[PDB]
């Protein structure tokens, strides 16, 4: 039985509104309703991995696992294995996989982050799951961010707190947060970003939804506008939204949006909004294609409709040669030429690089680079041809071209990362000097750039 080079992943996000689900939720796992939906001809075909994120979940882990497994079994006649379940308050993530994947999945991690202080600490935050599927690292974050149209700044802060403090993936990758730790990272939930239009426009918005005319609404979506000004989810992707706002509905129908202010809302309007979202970030030049993104029409127990997204995701096998793992393959080398970092920092310390990759026995520290002053104010850190020669554990080009090098630039004085990025080894040529580039981030904010040339030697 050959190891797969592709898997499909189902991502679900549902704010259940503290109500039990209805008896049938199969439409969710089948990607049926509104938006980019799944072909009918695929209905009996199981996804490899189902990741289910809930918010305001009133069920026990036991109660929800029984409904999920029975749902997938009715759809597929396959009995799914539980990989992981983690709950913080009423925020839950469940990971289910086909039984044939049980021995492909290892290094399962779960964590949570509680956002806010005193007043604002008590029910918002994120749960997460990571694991290895053969040679590919996968991370999943379900977040319930701060509610309310006037708290987009708070939501952006909630995001930064989750990506700094969620402890998933390989702890040896110490300079790197979850936005660099995974081949594929999926981040979903009730992100709670609203359509920022005047309250007096509520009926006009409802009219536009009934005409399936979403363009004017999406142009005011706070998550789209915050992302365009690089305030949040920098370097993440989202599929185009072609489904009605998923919040806020009257329960037991989908025919009415309940937007007017009420004691129960803290006298806040809830204009129809895309609260419920799926974004992803994969390493450069890895296959990832969104094959569905939409909302169900027939699950009406909550004031939110469930959202689904499915993805094709590139995966690699666990490689073993005569040499690595457990030694170097003298045939392989990675060389960096004419390299420099450009940093936004106002500081003056010396900087060195760290190279981290699963293709190395352990991370590699460079010599300090030479600081110069950029023509527009910037710090430029020159490495020239000084960077060490990296010694991969395996030289086979079928392995090595599928790998990535994570880069941290660190202060010599403090050993703190000023910037993190990622370089793909999926080059156009081997034994050839080729341009490389990555932006650099710290705490998910843009802090600089790394550029230069690479020269990759494989056994071919
Ligand atoms: C890493 N993805 C980038 C691609 C370029 C455009 N883009 C975007 C799209 C809509 C709203 C705001 C930003 C991104 O996020």
From Swiss-Prot:
Tissue specificity: Specifically expressed in immune and hematopoietic cells. Expressed in bone marrow and blood cells. Levels vary considerably within this compartment. Present in at least 74% of immature CD34+ cells, whereas within the more mature population of CD33+ cells, it is present in only 10% of cells. Present in the majority of T-cells, while it is present in a minority of B-cells (at protein level).
Swapping residue 288 to E leads to an effect described as: In one patient with acute myeloid leukemya; somatic mutation
PTM (free text): Tyrosine phosphorylated by the members of the SRC family after exposure to a diverse array of extracellular stimuli such as cytokines, growth factors, antibodies, chemokines, integrin ligands and hypertonic and oxidative stress. Phosphorylated upon IgG receptor FCGR2B-binding.
Q: Where in the cell is it found?
A: Cytoplasm; Cell membrane; Membrane raft; Cytoplasm, Cytoskeleton
Q: What note about domains is in the entry?
A: The SH2 domain interacts with tyrosine phosphorylated forms of proteins such as SHC1 or PTPN11/SHP-2. It competes with that of GRB2 for binding to phosphorylated SHC1 to inhibit the Ras pathway. It is also required for tyrosine phosphorylation. The NPXY sequence motif found in many tyrosine-phosphorylated proteins is required for the specific binding of the PID domain.
The subunit structure is: Interacts with tyrosine phosphorylated form of SHC1. Interacts with tyrosine phosphorylated form of DOK1. Interacts with tyrosine phosphorylated form of DOK3. Interacts with tyrosine phosphorylated form of SLAMF1/CD150. Interacts with PTPN11 in response to IL-3. Interacts with receptor EPOR. Interacts with receptors MS4A2/FCER1B and FCER1G. Interacts with receptors FCGR2B and FCGR3. Interacts with receptor FCGR2A, leading to regulate gene expression during the phagocytic process. Interacts with GRB2. Interacts with PLCG1. Interacts with tyrosine kinases SRC and TEC. Interacts with c-Met/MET.
What is stated as this protein's family in its record?
A: Belongs to the inositol 1,4,5-trisphosphate 5-phosphatase family.
What's this chain's function? Phosphatidylinositol (PtdIns) phosphatase that specifically hydrolyzes the 5-phosphate of phosphatidylinositol-3,4,5-trisphosphate (PtdIns(3,4,5)P3) to produce PtdIns(3,4)P2, thereby negatively regulating the PI3K (phosphoinositide 3-kinase) pathways. Able also to hydrolyzes the 5-phosphate of phosphatidylinositol-4,5-bisphosphate (PtdIns(4,5)P3) and inositol 1,3,4,5-tetrakisphosphate. Acts as a negative regulator of B-cell antigen receptor signaling.
According to UniProt, the name of this protein is Phosphatidylinositol 3,4,5-trisphosphate 5-phosphatase 1
* Protein's organism: Homo sapiens (Human)
Species classification: Eukaryota, Metazoa, Chordata, Craniata, Vertebrata
Relative to the complete UniProt sequence, the shown stretch is 398 to 857 of 1189
